[PDB]
Each structure stands twice: as structure tokens, then as C-alpha cells.
Design an enzyme around this catalytic site. Structure first.
Site, PDB file in Angstrom:
ATOM      1  N   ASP A  17      -7.346   9.919  33.557  1.00  0.00           N
ATOM      2  CA  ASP A  17      -6.697  11.177  33.067  1.00  0.00           C
ATOM      3  C   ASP A  17      -4.982  10.636  33.528  1.00  0.00           C
ATOM      4  OD1 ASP A  17      -6.532  13.931  32.679  1.00  0.00           O
ATOM      5  OD2 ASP A  17      -6.157  13.851  34.620  1.00  0.00           O
TER       6      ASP A  17
ATOM      7  N   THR B 262      -2.953  18.459  29.409  1.00  0.00           N
ATOM      8  CA  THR B 262      -1.781  18.435  30.259  1.00  0.00           C
ATOM      9  C   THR B 262      -0.905  16.771  29.728  1.00  0.00           C
ATOM     10  OG1 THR B 262      -3.629  18.380  32.287  1.00  0.00           O
ATOM     11  CG2 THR B 262      -1.136  17.917  32.613  1.00  0.00           C
ATOM     12  N   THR B 263      -1.398  15.506  29.376  1.00  0.00           N
ATOM     13  CA  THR B 263      -0.893  14.754  29.174  1.00  0.00           C
ATOM     14  C   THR B 263      -0.062  15.069  27.928  1.00  0.00           C
ATOM     15  OG1 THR B 263      -2.949  13.709  28.033  1.00  0.00           O
ATOM     16  CG2 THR B 263      -2.489  12.953  29.789  1.00  0.00           C
TER      17      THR B 263
ATOM     18  N   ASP C  44     -13.863  24.068  34.366  1.00  0.00           N
ATOM     19  CA  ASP C  44     -13.037  23.630  33.071  1.00  0.00           C
ATOM     20  C   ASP C  44     -13.546  25.427  32.235  1.00  0.00           C
ATOM     21  OD1 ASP C  44     -11.809  20.832  34.493  1.00  0.00           O
ATOM     22  OD2 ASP C  44     -13.392  19.894  33.415  1.00  0.00           O
TER      23      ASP C  44
END
Lengths: 79, 55, 487
Positions: free
Chosen positions: C44, C77-78, C355
């Protein structure tokens, strides 16, 4: 983590893994993505265990004793 | 097809020759071989996954 | 002016491409032993960005994007880094062609709002609360983990916690504010309970009566100290009023309730729990209604908080927890009482429940849903290319420059899944231009198909927030043209 299960097999689980590393490097040097090599290793092992379980041996019954006494004899060869 | 009983012809662990094992009694538990193949593949997959570094 | 803008472009593009391979669930793990020994084995990219030694400004603004996208939606996020880095890489062609960065930034703003309005009606929206599709998104999210066997253990509990309080926060959306959470080490994973009101986990061990129906609650943060004057007067005030359950804080000193005052507070056997957690103290006060008062002369008769059942009860046989109902306004953050004998079934259960929280607040702030996995990026790269064909002026390439920079998300998804990236991307474009939107790259089986049959779907606000944040920071870094040290 292999060592806590059955004892031996540690040098084999190192050596086969290292040869998988080497052949996977030879594959990914041929413009192959490591995702494909990882999934191919997974499918190969999943097929190989069913290859093993179709061709195992349960001869060592209470009737399998000549093979068992032969196992005992060949375990102490040249003594 | 008829020679299915030429399958366990392994290596002599002492002198190194092609030899019987079922008649010779050379045996190893199947759960050992299966778990070793599983853990070897898991180790190979994990170290192949660490790839994307110029290092 | 341009020589520093180009360095910003190159630094932000390099820090975006350092996590570009980690996009998707087949994103491979990293290892950077930069610094003093960082064994950074993780797939991640958010925790990769949080450990990146970053000295450049534009490289640090994408690290700010990472935390901003984690705050807004908790996912993608990426993606907000890869989209921004590809956009800033595509700004170099517009810079060398002759366009000033103001026109580039405002055309990116136009392309951003056009992409948002294109994505917002090409979705498959939900019409009601629709708890079946909340559990469907839970199967997309709460599964593919070690809590896959705890998925039915955890998804309808939070679904029913939002059913209890569909709370009026940001247009009756899920806040972090439904019914207060706790977690206890030990127990089984089935030992989670859905509560009504305040719970405490810490060890109160009173032999006497802490079980009062009118459990009066105070927060006296005045513990005991060492020089009788400023020592026993709070306990005399307890004998005045009768606050039978009071959470203790050690804000003054360390000997919190010594035997002089402890037997005074065990002559009626008050609840005693010390070293209360600071961020949850104000939530506890929002629950109870008492005042977080340490000055013992500021203890008044209107500081008497309300509670109905307060027990040091062994919940689930042995967990001596202090649960509280009947408060002024309880309910502080969605309850999943994380019990687990193993440690991984504690941390992964709580992380997956967070989550689930960040996706159900995504599902109801914006109540639409799209097929994730490269399909809306190809849709945007088609429709924005058509719009940039219709658009005139120097912006006509920049929106086109906005379009091609959208194409990195399927291609990486094509590359990380082992497919040949460019051919699969343009075949996806040819399929989408005459077929559907939902066609994309199923990474979960590794093949290009209709994803809405293969069920890799995501709420809309993840993609909208990622595009908004990426365009905002790309806009800012384009407008940034000077730096100066030495204040």
C-alpha cells in the site's frame, strides 16, 4: 515457518524457492511481467498437488509388511 | 499406458543410481512434500513481488 | 520562473512514479532502506508516502494529497498521486508549446468540473438507504482480507448502527459520530456487541456498589497529590452530591486516589478508572453532559451527568467493562467492540471496520456508485477528448492534456495485472466508444471485460474527490513559480 511444521525439508524449501527465483528472473528478463510469473507458479503448484494426490501410495497397510521390512532393511544399508 | 508401474523410480540416496522406491521402501509423508512445495511457492512469490526498486 | 517550475514538475512526477506500480490490488510491495534502516515491505502506497524522506515542496504537496484523500474518502490514496503526477508531467508539453501556467490551470479547472459532471450522471445510483447494496459494497471492501470470515460478523452491525442513527451530518451522511466505539484485548471475534451509549474498557475493581440506576457522573480531573487541604474536599463534595460513577484523571500528579481518599471513595465505592484517553474525553463529555472540570471549587450541582445502567460487568463472561446508557447526548463513533484473543483479529477487524465506515460515508455523502477499475478514467479520457475538440483557444489542448493524463490509471492497472498496457488500453477505448461505460480491466481475475458483471465497483465520491484534489494540487504547483529560504 516451514521448520515449525514437519522438521526437515528446510534445504529443499530453500533450494526449490531459489530456483524459482532464478527461473522467474530469466523469464522477466524476456519482457514478462512478474504478475504473470507469480500466477503461473500458483497454477503450477495447484496442479502439481493434484498430480501428487492422484498418485500417492497407501501400500503400508497392515498387509504391507514385506515392503515395510524391506524399508527397514534398506534404511540400514551397508552396515 | 501399461507401464504405469514405472513411476516411483527415484534416486538411490546412498550410491546414486536409478532405482525402485516402492519395493525399496524409500518413503516420505505426502503432507511433508505438499507443505514444502506450498511454502517454497509462497517464498518465491513473496520475493518476486519485491521488484519495483532500482536498488 | 520556468527553471523552478520545471524542477517542481520533475520532483512531483518522480515522487508520484515512486508509488505508481503500487496501484491496484496487484500493486507490488516496496523496500526502501532510506534513512536509518527502514524495512518498508508493504503493498500500500499511503504508508510508503508517509515514510518517504521528502525535501522538495512539490514532492511534499502530493504527500499532503495522500492524507487529504484519506481524510475525505479513505480510499484511492495512490490514485490522487498518480493522476497528479501524470497531469504535471503532461504540463511540460503545454509549457514548452508556449501556454502560460494561468491558462493551463484554469483550463484544468474547466476540465475538472466537466469531468465531475460527466462522472456524476454516468453512474448507477442508489435510491434509498439500500442496505442490500451497502452489504454489496461491504463484499467489495470488507472481504478480500482475514476478516472475510468476519464479514457477516461486522458489516450488518455497522449497517444497523447507521440504521439506528441516520445522523444529520453533511446532508444526513455518515459522520464519525454514530454510537461510541471501544475495543478489548482478548475474547473471541464473535464477542463484538452493538451498544447504546458509553462503554469503558479499563479495569475498575470495586468490591462494593457501582451499580446505580441514577448513576450520577462527573469528570473530576483532580487526582491526589503530595505536599490535606487540596486533597479531601472533592471527596467531601462527593459525599455532598453523590456522584457514584466518576472517571478519574491523573492530570495533577501520579498518586491518583490514595488510601486516605480511596477508602473515603470506597466507603461508598465509587467507580474508579484513571488515565482516560484525551481525544475521547471530550467525546465522553459530549455523551454525558458533565463538565470536564479539574478545579474542585468549580464542581457545581449542574455538573451532574446522567446514566441509567452503569456496571463493572463481565461482558461476554470475563470482560469487566463499564457500559453506560441514558445520557444527555451519547453516541460518539460507530460501535464495533473489537474483541479478539489473537492480535491480528483485533487490528484487522478494527481497520476493516474503519474501511467500512469510510466507504459507507462515501456511499451516502454522494449516493451514487460506479464500476471501479479503470472504466471511468477511460470514459473521462474519451469524453474530455471530445469536449477539447469542441473547445476553442489555447485551452483546447490543455483539456486534451487533461484527457491523456487520465489514461495512466487503466494502463498501470493493465501493467500491474501483467497485461500489455498500451494495447489493452486502446482496446478498452475502442470497446467503450461503441459499447458501454462499465467495460474495464478486471484485476481480480486479470482480464478485460464488463466489470459490472465481474463486480469491481466503487462509490462515486472516491473518484470525484481524487480528481478534485489532484486537479487542485496540479493547479497550485503550476501557479507556484518562486521559492525563498532564509527567513
Amino acid at each position: 515457518l516451514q521448520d515449525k511444521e514437519v522438521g526437515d525439508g528446510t534445504t529443499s524449501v530453500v533450494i526449490i524457492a531459489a530456483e524459482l527465483l532464478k527461473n522467474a528472473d530469466e523469464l522477466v528478463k524476456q519482457k514478462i511481467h512478474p504478475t504473470s510469473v507469480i500466477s503461473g507458479y500458483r497454477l503450477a503448484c495447484k496442479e502439481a498437488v493434484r498430480y501428487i494426490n492422484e498418485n500417492l501410495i497407501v501400500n503400508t497397510d497392515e498387509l504391507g509388511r514385506d515392503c515395510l521390512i524391506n524399508a527397514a532393511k534398506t534404511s540400514m544399508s551397508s552396515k | 499406458p501399461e507401464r504405469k508401474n514405472l513411476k516411483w523410480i527415484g534416486l538411490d540416496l546412498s550410491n546414486g543410481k536409478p532405482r525402485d522406491n516402492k519395493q525399496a521402501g524409500v518413503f516420505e509423508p505426502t503432507i511433508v512434500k505438499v507443505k514444502s512445495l506450498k511454502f517454497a511457492t509462497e517464498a518465491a512469490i513473496t520475493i518476486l513481488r519485491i521488484d519495483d526498486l532500482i536498488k | 520562473p520556468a527553471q523552478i517550475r520545471f524542477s517542481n514538475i520533475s520532483a512531483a512526477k518522480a515522487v508520484a512514479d515512486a508509488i505508481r506500480t503500487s496501484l491496484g490490488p496487484k500493486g507490488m510491495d516496496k523496500m526502501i532502506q532510506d534513512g536509518k534502516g527502514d524495512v518498508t515491505i508493504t503493498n500500500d502506497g499511503a504508508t510508503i508516502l508517509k515514510q518517504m524522506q521528502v525535501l522538495h515542496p512539490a514532492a511534499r504537496m502530493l504527500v499532503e494529497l495522500s492524507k487529504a484523500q484519506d481524510i475525505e474518502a479513505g480510499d484511492g490514496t495512490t490514485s490522487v498521486v498518480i493522476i497528479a503526477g501524470s497531469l504535471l508531467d503532461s504540463c511540460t508539453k503545454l509549457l514548452q508549446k508556449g501556454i502560460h501556467p494561468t491558462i493551463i490551470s484554469e483550463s484544468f479547472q474547466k476540465a475538472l468540473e466537466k469531468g465531475i459532471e460527466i462522472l456524476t450522471d454516468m453512474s448507477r445510483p442508489v435510491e434509498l438507504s439500500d442496505r442490500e447494496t451497502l452489504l454489496n459494497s461491504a463484499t467489495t471492501s470488507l472481504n478480500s482480507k482475514v476478516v472475510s470470515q468476519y464479514s457477516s460478523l461486522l458489516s450488518p452491525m455497522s449497517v444497523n448502527a447507521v440504521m439506528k442513527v441516520i445522523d444529520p451530518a453533511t446532508a444526513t451522511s455518515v459522520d464519525l459520530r454514530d454510537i461510541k466505539i471501544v475495543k478489548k484485548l482478548g475474547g473471541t471475534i464473535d464477542d463484538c456487541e452493538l451498544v447504546e451509549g458509553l462503554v469503558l474498557t479499563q479495569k475498575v475493581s470495586n468490591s462494593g456498589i457501582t451499580r446505580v440506576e441514577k448513576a450520577k457522573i462527573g469528570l473530576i480531573q483532580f487526582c491526589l497529590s503530595a505536599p490535606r487541604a487540596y486533597i479531601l474536599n472533592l471527596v467531601k463534595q462527593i459525599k455532598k452530591t453523590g456522584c457514584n460513577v466518576l472517571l478519574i484523571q491523573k492530570s495533577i500528579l501520579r498518586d491518583a486516589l490514595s488510601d486516605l481518599a480511596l477508602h473515603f471513595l470506597n466507603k461508598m465505592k465509587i467507580m474508579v478508572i484513571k488515565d482516560i484517553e484525551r481525544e475521547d474525553i471530550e467525546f465522553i463529555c459530549k455523551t454525558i453532559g458533565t463538565k470536564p472540570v479539574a478545579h474542585i471549587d468549580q464542581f457545581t450541582a449542574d455538573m451532574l451527568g446522567s446514566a441509567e445502567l452503569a456496571e463493572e460487568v463481565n461482558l461476554n463472561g470475563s470482560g469487566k467493562l463499564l457500559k453506560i446508557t441514558g445520557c444527555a447526548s451519547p453516541g460518539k463513533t460507530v460501535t464495533i467492540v473489537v474483541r479478539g484473543s489473537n492480535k491480528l483479529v483485533i487490528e484487522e477487524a478494527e481497520r476493516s471496520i474503519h474501511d467500512a465506515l469510510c466507504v459507507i460515508r462515501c456511499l451516502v455523502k454522494k449516493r451514487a456508485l460506479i464500476a471501479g477499475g479503470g472504466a471511468p478514467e477511460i470514459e473521462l479520457a474519451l469524453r474530455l477528448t471530445e469536449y477539447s475538440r469542441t473547445l476553442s483557444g489555447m485551452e483546447s489542448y490543455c483539456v486534451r492534456a487533461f484527457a491523456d493524463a487520465m489514461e495512466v490509471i487503466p494502463s498501470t492497472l493493465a501493467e500491474n495485472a501483467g497485461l500489455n498496457p498500451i494495447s489493452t488500453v486502446t482496446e478498452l477505448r475502442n470497446r467503450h466508444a461503441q459499447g458501454e461505460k462499465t467495460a474495464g480491466i478486471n484485476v481480480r481475475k486479470g482480464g478485460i471485460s464488463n466489470i459490472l458483471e465481474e463486480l469491481v465497483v466503487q462509490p462515486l465520491l472516491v473518484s470525484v474527490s481524487a480528481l478534485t484534489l489532484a486537479t487542485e494540487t496540479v493547479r497550485s504547483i503550476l501557479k507556484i513559480d518562486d521559492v525563498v529560504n532564509t527567513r
